[PDB]
């Protein structure tokens, strides 16, 4: 574990992370996809060997010895708000199980279901609170990656307000 487990947020490509493993915002079919998924495919394409997994689950595939945790958030275009919320919470619980199983001291994580799977809604708070619910009992340093300047500020505020 980290000596003083922390949350941090950085605004940059998660393909450039400084953590011991990465969470991919994956699709269920293990396809290169778009956004974070496409960045992860470009950086760690070896990790997409048998990475297909259902919605609400995470499946880790090693790129060399570097773990890529493929976490499949729901596409809110396809799910009802209720069932999408349930699957999004479940995907993060499976991320916390994998981070724990791997014994890493740090993990790079994007906000699941916030991009093209958002169904055109702002899900920063929904997705971040499910991240916290799952990761709070872990002792890994968690570094959240985002691209939007206003999201960085809002994530940073949510982190700092619980310290
Ligand atoms: Cl960047
Ligand atoms: Cl997404
Ligand atoms: Cl963002």
Swiss-Prot record:
- Native organism: Chikungunya virus (strain S27-African prototype) (CHIKV)
Q: What is this protein called?
A: Non-structural protein 3
What is the covered span of the full protein? 1334 to 1493 of 2474
Q: Describe the processing and modification events after translation.
A: Phosphorylated by host on serines and threonines.
Consequence when changing residue 117 to V/W: Almost complete loss of mono-ADP-ribosylhydrolase activity
* Notes on the domains: In the N-terminus, the macro domain displays a mono-ADP-ribosylhydrolase activity. The central part called, the alphavirus unique domain (AUD) has a zinc-binding function. The C-terminus region, also called hypervariable domain (HVD), is mainly disordered and binds several host proteins. This intrinsically disordered domain contains 2 SH3 domain-binding sites and 2 FGDF motifs necessary and sufficient for the formation of nsP3/G3BP complexes.
Q: What is the effect of changing residue 36 to A?
A: Partial loss of mono-ADP-ribosylhydrolase activity
Q: Where in the cell is it found?
A: Host cytoplasmic vesicle membrane
The protein's job, in short, is:
Seems to be essential for minus-strand RNAs and subgenomic 26S mRNAs synthesis. Displays mono-ADP-ribosylhydrolase activity. ADP-ribosylation is a post-translational modification that controls various processes of the host cell and the virus probably needs to revert it for optimal viral replication. Binds proteins of G3BP family and sequesters them into the viral RNA replication complexes thereby inhibiting the formation of host stress granules on viral mRNAs.
